[model samples]
Target chain A: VLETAEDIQERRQQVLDRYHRFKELSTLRRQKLEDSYRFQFFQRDAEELEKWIQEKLQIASDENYKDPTNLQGKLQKHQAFEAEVQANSGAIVKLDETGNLMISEGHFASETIRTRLMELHRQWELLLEKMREKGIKLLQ
Target chain B: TAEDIQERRQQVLDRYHRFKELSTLRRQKLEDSYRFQFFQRDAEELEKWIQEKLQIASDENYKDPTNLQGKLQKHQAFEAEVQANSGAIVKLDETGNLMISEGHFASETIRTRLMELHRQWELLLEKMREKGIKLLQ
Candidate 1:
């Protein structure tokens, strides 16, 4: 069924509100980045980091930049990490749709969701550490 | 010494101009990539925020928010330049010219250009604290 005019208007307002909030938060994030001396240093060399990562990933190239052994191993690991991230992304979105659990059986479902998210966070941290070890420095 | 200084200043200006051109291209790229109409507007908002920061740093008096579109054009160039130089050392030298020290094996010509772009950004940021702009924690 089509949404009523009032529902459509309310949805539109929600969108506008979220859009403005995103803008405000983005500005704040930019300010924060600028304020940090570490980030300032990072900013100067950000392009270099990107290029380095791209080279490692063999992005924008058919052939690996490094020798097949070292580069291929790293590329495989990176691709695996990305696949893990993608899976977690899908899981998180699915969890988001579980809205306001009032069902009698919802407690178990919520616990499962929490455990999944915690596992995802742990994996993300390990991935981050691996990247950093590979010379992908973050904003210190 | 005077001739050298003049030459340095001209080089920085030239680089800044090129940076501005790249910024416009970045905007165009973003516009093409995003299907949402509001994406452009949001990007402009980001640009305007940077423009305001730059203006506040460069100008003594606080100016009302106008010429945002114009200011954004220039600001985006700086943004583009910064993005391009990421991982490089951006600093102001003793001679008050911008200096950029780049990562190993980076192009000498690009590094020099990026280095000189630093002064303009420094000028924009120098007065943020004094001007009561909120510092990001």
Candidate 2:
């Protein structure tokens, strides 16, 4: 069996390009799709962390501080808040650590991730500042 | 006991202040985390959907004339989705702009992400349109 027919040779060679090109295209597509999903996971993690903070912000900004009444109840609840926050502090630290880790791993969204972490740190500080401010007022 | 109650109140207030300070820091960290998540979540979803829509458009199976009308109808549904989801992109952009208005440090980075997502979405939309035209013809 003479397998190499000259007329059939051009057809076989022409399809090699298509197959090779397809392999490259498919690989790139997979890379992009993976990136899309990975980014989504990161965002979801960030979202949850933010929601929790907002809840505490609302409690801290309460008008209860305006009146000295129910001081014990408010103090008890504040104590509970402290316990809850301390317990969950790991989430914030983990988020920062993972974010930096992702960047170090050569994530395409490096700048975006870096920027978000910076802002997160800023708000964290602001919340700390405001909480202290009200703490003094509550004591009065 | 009223005087005793007042004295205890002072102690409680002083103790609670310390607790509140810790809560504030935690909460603030949360707020920032939330905003970043909101922006990226929306962006991720929009891009994901765009890719899904584009995948259909890029496929060559429609050329098989078997049940041509059915294929056309399916494409019309795809077209409708493309039109329906159009407003979401603008909403995400508006959110990014609002973040800037409120003075977020991530303003430039947010803008950059929006640009890339928008570029991909627009390119996909064009492909969807071209596919629609071919299917209709």
Task: Choose the strongest candidate by lDDT.
Answer: 2
Can you list the residue pairs that collide in candidate 2?
A50-B30, A50-B34, A127-B24, A128-B25
> Which portions of model 1 show Cα errors greater than 4 Å?
A1-124, A128-140, B1-50, B56-105, B125-137
Question: Which candidate's DockQ is highest?
Answer: 2
Chain A vs. true chain A, TM-score per model, equals 0.26, 0.69
Candidate 2 chain B weakest lDDT stretch, 10 residues: B128-137
- DockQ of each model vs. true complex: 0.02, 0.07
lDDT of 2 by residue, A100-134 (tens): 86688788888988888887777666666777776
Native contacts recovered, each model? 0.00, 0.06
lDDT of 1 by residue, A72-131 (tens): 344444444444333223222322323122123343244544554455445445545555
CA lDDT of each candidate? 0.39, 0.68
TM-score of each: 0.21, 0.44
Cα lDDT of candidate 2 equals 0.68
RMSD of each: 24.6, 14.7
- Candidate 1's error at B45, in angstroms? 13
Highest TM-score model number? 2
